[PDB]
PDB file of C-alpha atoms in Angstrom:
ATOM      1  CA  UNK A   1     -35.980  51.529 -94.514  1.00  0.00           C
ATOM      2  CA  UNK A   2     -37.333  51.104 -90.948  1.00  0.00           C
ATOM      3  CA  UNK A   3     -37.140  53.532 -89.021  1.00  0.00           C
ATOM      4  CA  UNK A   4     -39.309  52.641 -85.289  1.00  0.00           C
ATOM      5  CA  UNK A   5     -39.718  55.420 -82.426  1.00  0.00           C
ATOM      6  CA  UNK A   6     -36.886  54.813 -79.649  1.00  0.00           C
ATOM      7  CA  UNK A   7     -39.618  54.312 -77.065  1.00  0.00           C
ATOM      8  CA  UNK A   8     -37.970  55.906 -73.322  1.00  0.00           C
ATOM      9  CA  UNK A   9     -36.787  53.650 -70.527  1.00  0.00           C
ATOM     10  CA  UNK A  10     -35.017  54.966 -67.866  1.00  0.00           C
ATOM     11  CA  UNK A  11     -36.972  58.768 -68.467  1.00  0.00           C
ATOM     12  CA  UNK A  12     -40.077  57.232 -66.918  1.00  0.00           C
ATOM     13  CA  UNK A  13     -40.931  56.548 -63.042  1.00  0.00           C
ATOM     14  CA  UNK A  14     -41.262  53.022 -61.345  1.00  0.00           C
ATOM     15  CA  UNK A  15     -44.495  52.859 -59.859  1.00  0.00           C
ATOM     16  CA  UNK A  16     -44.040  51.454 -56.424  1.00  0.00           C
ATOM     17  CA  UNK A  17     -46.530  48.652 -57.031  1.00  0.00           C
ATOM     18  CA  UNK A  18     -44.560  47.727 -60.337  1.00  0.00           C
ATOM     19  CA  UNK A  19     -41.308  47.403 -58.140  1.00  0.00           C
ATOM     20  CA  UNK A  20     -42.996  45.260 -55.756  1.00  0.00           C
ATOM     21  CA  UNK A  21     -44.297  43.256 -58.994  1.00  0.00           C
ATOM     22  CA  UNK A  22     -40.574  43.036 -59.935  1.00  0.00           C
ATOM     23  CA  UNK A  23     -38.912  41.870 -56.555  1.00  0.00           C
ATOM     24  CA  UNK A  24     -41.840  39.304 -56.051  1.00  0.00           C
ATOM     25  CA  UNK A  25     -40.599  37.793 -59.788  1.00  0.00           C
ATOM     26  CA  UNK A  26     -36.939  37.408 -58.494  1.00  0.00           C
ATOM     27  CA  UNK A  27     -38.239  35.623 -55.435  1.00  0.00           C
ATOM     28  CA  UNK A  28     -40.198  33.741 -57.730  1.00  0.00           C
ATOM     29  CA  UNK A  29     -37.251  33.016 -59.741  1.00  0.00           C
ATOM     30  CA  UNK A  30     -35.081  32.137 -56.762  1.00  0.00           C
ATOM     31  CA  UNK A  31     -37.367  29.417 -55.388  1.00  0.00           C
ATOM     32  CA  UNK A  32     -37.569  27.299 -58.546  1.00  0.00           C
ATOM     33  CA  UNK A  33     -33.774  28.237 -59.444  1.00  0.00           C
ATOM     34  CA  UNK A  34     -32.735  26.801 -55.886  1.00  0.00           C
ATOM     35  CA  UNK A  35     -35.757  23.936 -56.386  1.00  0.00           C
ATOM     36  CA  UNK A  36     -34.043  22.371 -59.748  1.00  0.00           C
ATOM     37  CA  UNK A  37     -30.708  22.798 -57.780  1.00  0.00           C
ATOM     38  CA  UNK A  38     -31.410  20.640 -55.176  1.00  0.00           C
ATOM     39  CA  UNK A  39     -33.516  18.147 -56.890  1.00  0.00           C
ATOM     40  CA  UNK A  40     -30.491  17.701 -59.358  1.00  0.00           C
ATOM     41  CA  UNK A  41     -28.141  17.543 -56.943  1.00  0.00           C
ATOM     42  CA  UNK A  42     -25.809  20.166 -57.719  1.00  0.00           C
ATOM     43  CA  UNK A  43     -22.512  19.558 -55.367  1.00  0.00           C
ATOM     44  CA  UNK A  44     -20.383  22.544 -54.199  1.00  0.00           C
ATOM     45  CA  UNK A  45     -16.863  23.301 -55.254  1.00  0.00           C
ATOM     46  CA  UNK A  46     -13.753  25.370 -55.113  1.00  0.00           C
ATOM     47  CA  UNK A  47     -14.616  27.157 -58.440  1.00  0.00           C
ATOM     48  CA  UNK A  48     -17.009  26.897 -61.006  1.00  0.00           C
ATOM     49  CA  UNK A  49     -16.466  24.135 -63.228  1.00  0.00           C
ATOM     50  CA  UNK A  50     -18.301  23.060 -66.169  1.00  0.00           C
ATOM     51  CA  UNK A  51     -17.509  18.938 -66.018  1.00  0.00           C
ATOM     52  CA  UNK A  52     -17.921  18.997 -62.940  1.00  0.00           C
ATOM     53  CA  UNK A  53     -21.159  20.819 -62.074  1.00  0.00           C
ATOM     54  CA  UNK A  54     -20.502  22.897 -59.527  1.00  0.00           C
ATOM     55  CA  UNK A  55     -22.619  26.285 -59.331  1.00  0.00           C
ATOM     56  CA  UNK A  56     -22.774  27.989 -56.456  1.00  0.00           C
ATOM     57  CA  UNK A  57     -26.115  29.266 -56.037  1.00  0.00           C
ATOM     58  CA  UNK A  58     -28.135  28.283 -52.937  1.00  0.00           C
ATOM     59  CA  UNK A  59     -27.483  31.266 -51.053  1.00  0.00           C
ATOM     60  CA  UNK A  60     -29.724  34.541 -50.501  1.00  0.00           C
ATOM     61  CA  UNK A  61     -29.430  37.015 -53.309  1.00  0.00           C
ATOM     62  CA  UNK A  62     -30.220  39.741 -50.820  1.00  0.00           C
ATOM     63  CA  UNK A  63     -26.536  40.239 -50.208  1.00  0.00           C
ATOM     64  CA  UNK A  64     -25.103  40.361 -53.763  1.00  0.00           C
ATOM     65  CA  UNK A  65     -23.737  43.316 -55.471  1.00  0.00           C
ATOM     66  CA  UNK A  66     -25.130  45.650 -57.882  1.00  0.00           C
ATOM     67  CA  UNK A  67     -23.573  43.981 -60.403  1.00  0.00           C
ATOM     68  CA  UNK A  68     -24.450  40.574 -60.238  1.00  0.00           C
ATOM     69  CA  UNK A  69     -28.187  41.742 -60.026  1.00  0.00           C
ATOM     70  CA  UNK A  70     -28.518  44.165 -62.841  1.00  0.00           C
ATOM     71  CA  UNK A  71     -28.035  41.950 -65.679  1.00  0.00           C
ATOM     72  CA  UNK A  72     -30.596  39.588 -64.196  1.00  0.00           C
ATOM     73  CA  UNK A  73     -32.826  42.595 -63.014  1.00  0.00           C
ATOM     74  CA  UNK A  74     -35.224  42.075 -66.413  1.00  0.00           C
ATOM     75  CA  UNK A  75     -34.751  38.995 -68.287  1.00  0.00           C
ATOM     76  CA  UNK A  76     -38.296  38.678 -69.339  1.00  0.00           C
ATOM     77  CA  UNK A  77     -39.429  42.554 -68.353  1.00  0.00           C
ATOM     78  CA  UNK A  78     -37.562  43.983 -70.878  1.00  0.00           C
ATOM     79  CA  UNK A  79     -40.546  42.324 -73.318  1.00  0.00           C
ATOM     80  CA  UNK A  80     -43.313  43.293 -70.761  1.00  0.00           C
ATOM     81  CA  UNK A  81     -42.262  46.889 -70.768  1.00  0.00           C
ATOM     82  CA  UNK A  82     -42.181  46.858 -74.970  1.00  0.00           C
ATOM     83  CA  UNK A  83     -45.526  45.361 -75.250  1.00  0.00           C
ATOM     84  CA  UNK A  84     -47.609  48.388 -72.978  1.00  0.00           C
ATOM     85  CA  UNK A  85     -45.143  51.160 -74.797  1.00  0.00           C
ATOM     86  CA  UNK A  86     -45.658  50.150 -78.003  1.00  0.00           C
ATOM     87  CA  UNK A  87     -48.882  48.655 -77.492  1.00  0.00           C
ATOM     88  CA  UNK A  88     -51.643  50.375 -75.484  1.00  0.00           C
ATOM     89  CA  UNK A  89     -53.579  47.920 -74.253  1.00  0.00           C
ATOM     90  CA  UNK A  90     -52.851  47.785 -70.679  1.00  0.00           C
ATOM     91  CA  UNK A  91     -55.626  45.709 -68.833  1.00  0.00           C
ATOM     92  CA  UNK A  92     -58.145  46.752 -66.144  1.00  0.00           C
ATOM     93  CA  UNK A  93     -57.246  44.273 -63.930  1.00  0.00           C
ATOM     94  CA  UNK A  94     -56.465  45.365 -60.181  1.00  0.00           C
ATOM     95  CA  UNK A  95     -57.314  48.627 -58.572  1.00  0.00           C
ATOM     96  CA  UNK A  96     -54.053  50.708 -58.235  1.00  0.00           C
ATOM     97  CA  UNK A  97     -52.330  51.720 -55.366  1.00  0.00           C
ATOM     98  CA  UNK A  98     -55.478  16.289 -52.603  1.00  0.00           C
ATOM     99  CA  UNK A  99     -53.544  16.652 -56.464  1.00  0.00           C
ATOM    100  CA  UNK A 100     -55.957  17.594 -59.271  1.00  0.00           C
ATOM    101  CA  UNK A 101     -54.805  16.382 -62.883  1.00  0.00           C
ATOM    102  CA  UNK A 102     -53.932  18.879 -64.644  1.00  0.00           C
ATOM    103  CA  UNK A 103     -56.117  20.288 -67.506  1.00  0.00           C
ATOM    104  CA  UNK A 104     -55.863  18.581 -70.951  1.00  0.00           C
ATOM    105  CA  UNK A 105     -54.857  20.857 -73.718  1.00  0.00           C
ATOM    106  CA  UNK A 106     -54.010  18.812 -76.779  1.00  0.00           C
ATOM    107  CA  UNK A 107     -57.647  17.304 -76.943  1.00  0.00           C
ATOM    108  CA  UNK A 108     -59.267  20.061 -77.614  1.00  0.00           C
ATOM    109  CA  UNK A 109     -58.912  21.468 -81.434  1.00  0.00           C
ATOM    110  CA  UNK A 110     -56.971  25.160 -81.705  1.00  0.00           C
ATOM    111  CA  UNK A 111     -59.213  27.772 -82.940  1.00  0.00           C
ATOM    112  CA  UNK A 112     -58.579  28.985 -86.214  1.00  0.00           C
ATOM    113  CA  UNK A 113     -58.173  32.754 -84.842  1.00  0.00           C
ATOM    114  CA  UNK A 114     -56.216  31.428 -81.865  1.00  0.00           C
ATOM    115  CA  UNK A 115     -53.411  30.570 -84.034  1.00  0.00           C
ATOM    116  CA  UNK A 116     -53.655  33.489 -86.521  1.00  0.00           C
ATOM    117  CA  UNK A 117     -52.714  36.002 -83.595  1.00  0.00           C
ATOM    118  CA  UNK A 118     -50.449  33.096 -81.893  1.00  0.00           C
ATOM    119  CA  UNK A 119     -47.592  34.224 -85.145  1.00  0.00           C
ATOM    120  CA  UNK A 120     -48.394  38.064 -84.780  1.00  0.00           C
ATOM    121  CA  UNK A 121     -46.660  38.477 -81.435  1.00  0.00           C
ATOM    122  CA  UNK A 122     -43.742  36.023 -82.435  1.00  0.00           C
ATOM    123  CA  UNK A 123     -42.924  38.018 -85.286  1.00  0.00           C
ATOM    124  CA  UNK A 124     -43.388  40.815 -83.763  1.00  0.00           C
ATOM    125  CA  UNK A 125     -41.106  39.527 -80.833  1.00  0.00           C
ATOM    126  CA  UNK A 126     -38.411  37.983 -83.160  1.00  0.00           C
ATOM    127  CA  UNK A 127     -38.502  41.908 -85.158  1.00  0.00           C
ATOM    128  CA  UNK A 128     -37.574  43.033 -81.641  1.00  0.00           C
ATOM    129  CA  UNK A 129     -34.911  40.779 -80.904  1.00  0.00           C
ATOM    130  CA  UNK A 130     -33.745  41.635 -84.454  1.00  0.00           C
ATOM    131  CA  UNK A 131     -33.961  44.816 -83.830  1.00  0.00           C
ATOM    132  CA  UNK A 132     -32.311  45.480 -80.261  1.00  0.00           C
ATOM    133  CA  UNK A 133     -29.626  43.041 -81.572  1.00  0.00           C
ATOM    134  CA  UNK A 134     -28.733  44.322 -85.069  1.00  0.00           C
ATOM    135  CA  UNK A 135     -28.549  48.168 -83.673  1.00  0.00           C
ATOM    136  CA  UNK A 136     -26.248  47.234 -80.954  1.00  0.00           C
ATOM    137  CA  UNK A 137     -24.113  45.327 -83.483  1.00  0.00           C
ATOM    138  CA  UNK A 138     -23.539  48.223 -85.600  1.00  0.00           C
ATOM    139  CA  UNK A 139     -23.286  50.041 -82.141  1.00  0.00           C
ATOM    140  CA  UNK A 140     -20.013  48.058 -81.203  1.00  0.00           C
ATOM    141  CA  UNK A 141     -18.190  47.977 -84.800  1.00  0.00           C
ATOM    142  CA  UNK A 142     -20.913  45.388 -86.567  1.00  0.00           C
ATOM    143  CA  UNK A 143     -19.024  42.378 -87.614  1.00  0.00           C
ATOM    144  CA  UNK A 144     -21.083  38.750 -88.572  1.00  0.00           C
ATOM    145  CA  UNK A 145     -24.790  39.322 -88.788  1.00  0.00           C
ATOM    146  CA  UNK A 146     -26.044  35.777 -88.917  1.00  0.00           C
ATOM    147  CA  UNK A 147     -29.819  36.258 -87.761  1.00  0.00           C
ATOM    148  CA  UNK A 148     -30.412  37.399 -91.803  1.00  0.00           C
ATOM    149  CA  UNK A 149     -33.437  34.206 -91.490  1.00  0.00           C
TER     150      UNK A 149
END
């Protein structure tokens, strides 16, 4: 019954300020990965364990392989790049190329459009995951389908 346009990935170019955009969120994902690591105390081990948490991670991720990279290439970007292909609304924001409390949030009453458009994207988002889920289900054989919520 729906039928949406298979919007191209890979047929596009990387802008060179979107790749830098991209390796300054891995950094950025590094530091608080390693962060949580050490604050929890995560001891090393012979292998990877689950009772005894061991996880081998505070190391550069400059020297991994291609492999071990790709899956965690876009774990959030895969969104970002749905919402300006689907969507064009991409903002005019940049040209191209001692401890403050932190704000209150709760205090202040939510707007009565604020949370009208606040379900509009999460539908919208859970559709997607519906969507790139179910077609690679049926891609692979199909099977159980239990996201029919």
């Amino acid at each position: 019954n729906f039928d949406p346009r298979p919007v191209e990935t890979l047929n596009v170019i990387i802008p060179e300020k979107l790749d830098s955009f991209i390796n300054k969120f891995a950094e950025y994902t590094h530091e608080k990965w390693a962060f949580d690591k050490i604050q929890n105390n995560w001891s090393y081990g012979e292998n990877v364990d689950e009772e005894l948490k061991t996880h081998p991670m505070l190391r550069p991720y400059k020297t991994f392989s291609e492999k071990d990279k790709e899956i965690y290439r876009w774990p959030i970007k895969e969104s970002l790049k749905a919402m300006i292909a689907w969507e064009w609304t991409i903002e005019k924001a940049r040209e191209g190329e001692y401890n403050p409390q932190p704000p209150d949030l709760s205090g202040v009453t939510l707007s009565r459009e604020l949370q009208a458009m606040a379900e509009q994207l999460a539908e919208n988002y859970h559709n997607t995951w519906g969507r790139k889920k179910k077609q690679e289900l049926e891609a692979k054989g199909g099977g159980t389908h239990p996201l029919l919520v």
